[PDB]
């Protein structure tokens, strides 16, 4: 009578497969608002 082959694994080998990696490319960077000009002139200078 021939012996049937071995068909067993440890839980580590079938559950802990070397996993694929998550998406490394996650770049975010907020833009800079365009500044507005300065439009003031002191009251002594405006009219004296």
């Amino acid at each position: 009578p021939p012996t049937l082959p071995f068909h067993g694994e440890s839980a580590y080998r079938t559950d802990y497969v070397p996993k694929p990696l998550p998406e490394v490319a996650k770049p975010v960077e907020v833009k800079l608002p365009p500044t507005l000009p300065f439009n003031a002139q002191s009251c002594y200078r405006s009219e004296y």
Partner: peptide, 25 residues
């Protein structure tokens, strides 16, 4: 450094930044 908790929802002036009815005529 992912400054989302400083992500401006305001502008240079203080305020903040930019985010039916069937009328009986």
């Amino acid at each position: 450094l992912y400054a989302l908790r400083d992500h401006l929802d305001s502008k240079l002036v203080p305020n903040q930044s930019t985010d039916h009815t069937n009328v009986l005529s």
